[PDB]
């Protein structure tokens, strides 16, 4: 047995802390810190709880680990940008795995893995494909924002990098901030781009070529020597530039006491919808730049399989278009493309270095905590709420869904990454023409223009989608076929695009069953599947989490374990 605990998250100036445990190349456990702490984005923290969970889940202690792997070259970053790496391996271990939570007889080997390598590792080793081109597109690793590499024979070899100042991630963030959606919500920007019109995709900043892009707005060698990313530098350049060329100035945040809620709430001066054309344009500029990069690495390696990771990898809209490109046959992007994924990537890199074979993820991301019926009961009995234990839960849930009701679904092991995949999901009819507005405005109280996405049986996805492939992670848009382009109004765009999760019975028997039962009711085993949370809070993880969010939202029912709660 080779056991490698991979980590991300650090007390100084970090985000998306997470922890993954590989055992014999298999994922034993994987969790994001935010899910357990309830603090969004897992900011400025070692993945303390996530690692504790991995170890408990696998019944291990630190002393049972062959290696601890960290998904950045921290010593390097501390050398170049802070004037020295002051930590012994043991001292660093004390910070990443505090002894009061993680008792240990001795230190495990500590490995720092280069940030993009980890990103790449988390794509390649888990793709189930044995070779391909690697495209890593990011905010910024230690010094680079893009990495093009060749993945073959269990090896990842770098061909080229792009300096952070030219970051597509930072660009897209900055635009996201400029619009008032916020730099921490780029996904929203993507959503918004769909409502805009693109005028000049260069933004008078980018110049696109056949190998990607160049950004004459900023000197590519511009370092913010103070910090250890070029975020501030790119932020000034982009904000001043956008204000010059775009009709709207930066949207501003407004903080006022709301007597209705009894607190200071943050709002935006302008409606971010006003910025839709700027979103469209940013989206298009990102796509264009990324199309170039993809073509370039594909051709430099002579592969037709593409691997994508780094946070830009979360842009399903851009991925869908990569997939349909003539330069692309197959595509894998892991559900943990962002930094949460570099704990797993670091682990994989190390495990591979230690002689392990890494198994494929295989159409599921359900690696987080799960809870026994007794545990769920404990959480239920805490609330003093009445609940049933349906003979056939999956059928009853299907019936509620078919009737246009919204059902919280908390089953098995939490999924990892930003997307609910039927372990912690809010479910609704994919068939209702009013469901989208209902969930947006009445249920989640979020923006009217936000889109929804479907889960469907893999077994019918060939009839529903123009591509007969696995889409396990909702990480890629594709188009529906004619016969379904109006059947599914809540989850299909006017242009027939959608962002689907395909569901194998192996991946999720319960979800699979529920969908099957739904098909027997409304013809298609397809439903609307949106993240289970009140907006701005992370996806629920524990039954107590589920009950809390259920109690605060006008959801109709909660299916948590084998129990069903109604309002």
Ligand X SMILES: Nc1ncnc2c1ncn2[C@@H]1O[C@H](COP(=O)(O)OP(=O)(O)O)[C@@H](O)[C@H]1O
Known binding-site residues equal 13, 40, 115, 119, 138, 140, 169, 173, 229, 311, 315, 339, 419-420, 450, 499, 529-531
Instruction: State phi, psi for 133 to the nearest 5 degrees.
Output: -85, 145
Indicate the annotated binding residues for tobramycin.
13, 173, 229
Q: Which does 190 bind (CB under 5 to 8 A by kind): ligand X, Fe ion, none?
A: ligand X
Residues of 234-266 as b/e, b for ≥16 C-beta within 10 angstroms? bbebbbebbeeebeeebbeeeeeeeeeeeeeee
Whole-number Å distance between alpha carbons of 557 and 565: 5
Residues in binding site for carbamoyl phosphate: 419-420, 499, 529-531
List 1, 15, 111, 241, catalytic entry: 15
Give the Cα separation of 12 and 45 in Å (integer). Answer: 7
DSSP 450-494: ----EEEEHHHHHHHBSS-S---SS---EEBPGGGTTT-TTTS-T
Residue nearest to Fe ion (CB): 138
Sheet strands side by side (includes 3-8):
26-32, 18-23, 3-8, 67-70, 110-112
Closest distance to ligand X from the beta carbon of 441 (Å): 23
Residue 169 binding partner per list ligand X, Fe ion, none, with a CB distance cut-off of 5 to 8 Å that depends on partner kind: ligand X
* Smallest distance, Fe ion to C-beta of residue 192, A: 23
**486-525 burial string, b = 16+ CB within 10 Å, else e?**
ebbbbbbeeebbbbbbbbbeebbebbbbbbbbbbeebebb
Closest CB to ligand X among residues 187, 408: 187
**Least distance between ligand X and beta carbon 50 (Å):** 16
CB 3 within 8 A of CB 21: yes
How near is the Cβ of 102 to ligand X at its closest, in Å? 25
Nearest CB to ligand X, comparing residues 311 and 335 = 311
363 binds, among Fe ion, ligand X, none (CB under 5 to 8 A by kind): none
Q: How far apart are CA 522 and CA 535, in angstroms?
A: 30
92 vs 136, which CB is nearer to Fe ion?
136
Nearer to Fe ion, 186 or 196 (CB): 186
Phi, psi of 364 (to 5 degrees): -155, 150
- How many CB atoms are located within 10 Å of the residue 41 CB? 17
Neighbours of 323 (CB within 10 A): 19
* Secondary structure (H, E, C), 418-444: CCCCCCEEEEEECCCCCHHHHHHHHHC
Binding residues for Fe cation: 115, 119, 138, 339
CA dihedral 228, 234, 239, 240 (to 10 degrees): 120
Nearer to ligand X, 251 or 508 (CB): 251
Here's the x/- map for Fe ion, 283-322, by CB under 5 A: it reads as ----------------------------------------
At its nearest, how many Å lie between ligand X and the CB of residue 458?
A: 24
Q: Is 138 in the site for Fe ion (CB under 5 A)?
A: yes
Closest approach of Cβ 213 to ligand X, in Å?
14
Contact 74, 14 (CB under 8 A): no
396 touches Fe ion by CB under 5 A: no
Burial (0-12, 13-18, 19+ Cβ within 10 Å), 211? middle
Q: Hey, is 37 helix, strand or coil?
A: helix
Residues annotated as binding site for carbamoyl adenylate?
Answer: 140, 169, 173, 311, 315
Of residues 16 and 33, the one with the C-beta less far from ligand X: 16
| Residues in touch with ligand X (CB under 6 A) | 16, 138-141, 169-170, 172-173, 186-187, 190, 286, 310-312, 314-315, 338-339
Shortest distance in whole angstroms from residue 491 CB to Fe ion? 30
* Contact status: 142 vs Fe ion (CB under 5 A): no
Q: Taking contact as CB under 5 A, which single stretch among the options 77-85, 337-345, 399-407, 454-462 is the one that binds Fe ion?
A: 337-345
Please confirm, yes or no, whether 493 is among the known catalytic residues.
no
Q: How far is the CB of 172 from ligand X (least distance, A)?
A: 4
Q: What is the spatial distance between Cα 311 and Cα 184, in angstroms, rounded to a whole number?
A: 11
Q: How many residues does the chain have?
A: 567
Breaks in the chain (C–N beyond 2.5 Å) sit after none
Which listed range, 134-142, 205-213, 291-299, 395-403, lies at the site for Fe ion (CB under 5 A)? Answer: 134-142
CB closer to ligand X, 324 vs 375: 324
Return d(Cα 217, Cα 169) in angstroms, integer.
15
**Alpha carbon separation from 231 to 305, 393, 415, 558 (Å, rounded):** 31, 49, 30, 41
Between 138 and 356, CB nearer to ligand X:
138
Choose the one of ligand X, Fe ion, none that binds residue 422, judging by a C-beta under 5 to 8 angstroms depending on kind: none
Which residues have a catalytic role annotated?
Answer: 15
| Binding stretches for Fe ion (CB under 5 A) | 138, 339
């Amino acid at each position: 047995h080779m056991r490698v605990l991979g980590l991300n998250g650090w007390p100084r100036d970090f985000h998306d802390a997470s922890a993954a445990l590989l055992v014999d190349g298999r994922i034993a456990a994987f969790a994001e810190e935010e899910r357990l702490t309830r603090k969004k984005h897992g900011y400025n923290t070692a993945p303390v709880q996530a690692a504790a969970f991995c170890l408990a889940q696998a019944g291990l202690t630190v002393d049972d680990l062959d290696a601890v792997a960290f998904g950045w070259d921290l010593p390097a970053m501390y050398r170049e940008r802070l004037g020295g790496w002051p930590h012994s391996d043991s001292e660093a271990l004390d910070i990443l795995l505090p002894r009061d939570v993680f008792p240990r007889r001795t230190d495990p080997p500590l490995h720092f893995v280069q940030h993009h390598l980890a990103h790449a590792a988390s794509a390649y080793y888990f793709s189930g494909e044995d070779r391909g081109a690697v495209l890593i597109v990011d905010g910024q690793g230690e010094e680079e924002c893009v990495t093009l590499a060749h993945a073959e024979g269990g090896k990842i070899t770098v061909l080229d990098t792009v300096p952070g100042a030219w970051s597509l991630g930072f660009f897209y963030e900055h635009v996201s901030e400029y619009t008032g959606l916020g730099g921490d919500n780029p996904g929203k920007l993507m959503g918004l781009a769909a409502h805009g019109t693109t005028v000049d995709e260069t933004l008078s900043a980018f110049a696109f070529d056949s190998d990607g892009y160049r950004l004459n707005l900023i000197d590519p060698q511009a370092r913010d020597p103070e910090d250890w990313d070029e975020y501030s530098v790119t932020e000034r350049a982009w904000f001043a530039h956008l204000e010059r060329i775009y009709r709207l100035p930066p949207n501003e945040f407004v903080r006022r006491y709301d007597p209705a809620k009894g607190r200071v709430v943050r709002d935006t001066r302008r409606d971010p919808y006003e910025y839709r054309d700027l979103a469209a344009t940013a989206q298009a500029a990102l796509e264009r730049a990324v199309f170039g990069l993809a073509d370039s690495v594909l051709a430099r390696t002579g592969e037709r399989t593409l691997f994508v990771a780094g946070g830009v990898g979360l842009n399903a809209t851009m991925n869908g278009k990569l997939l349909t490109r003539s330069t692309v046959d197959k595509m894998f992007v892991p559900p943990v493309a962002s930094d949460i994924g570099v704990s797993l990537g670091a682990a994989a890199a190390v495990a591979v270095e230690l002689g392990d074979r890494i198994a494929p993820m295989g159409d599921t991301a359900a690696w987080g905590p799960e809870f026994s019926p007794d545990q769920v009961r404990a959480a239920l009995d805490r609330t003093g709420l009445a609940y049933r234990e349906p003979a056939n839960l999956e059928r009853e849930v299907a019936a509620l869904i078919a009737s246009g009701k919204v059902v919280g679904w908390a089953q098995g092991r939490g999924e990892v990454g930003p997307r609910a995949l039927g372990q912690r999901s809010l479910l609704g009819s994919a068939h209702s023409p009013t469901m989208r507005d209902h969930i947006n405005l009445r249920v989640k109280d979020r923006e009217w223009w936000r889109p929804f996405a479907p889960s469907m049986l893999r077994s019918v996805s060939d009839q529903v989608l123009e591509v007969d492939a696995d889409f396990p992670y909702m990480i890629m848009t594709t188009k529906v076929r004619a016969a379904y382009a109006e059947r599914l109004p809540s989850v299909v765009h006017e242009d027939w695009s959608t962002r689907p999760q395909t569901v194998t019975e192996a991946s999720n028997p319960r979800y699979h069953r529920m969908l099957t039962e739904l098909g027997d009711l409304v013809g298609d085993p397809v439903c609307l599947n949106t993240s289970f949370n009140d907006r701005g809070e992370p996806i629920v993880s524990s039954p107590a989490d589920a009950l809390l969010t259920f109690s605060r939202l006008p959801i109709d029912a909660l299916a948590v374990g084998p129990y069903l709660v109604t309002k």
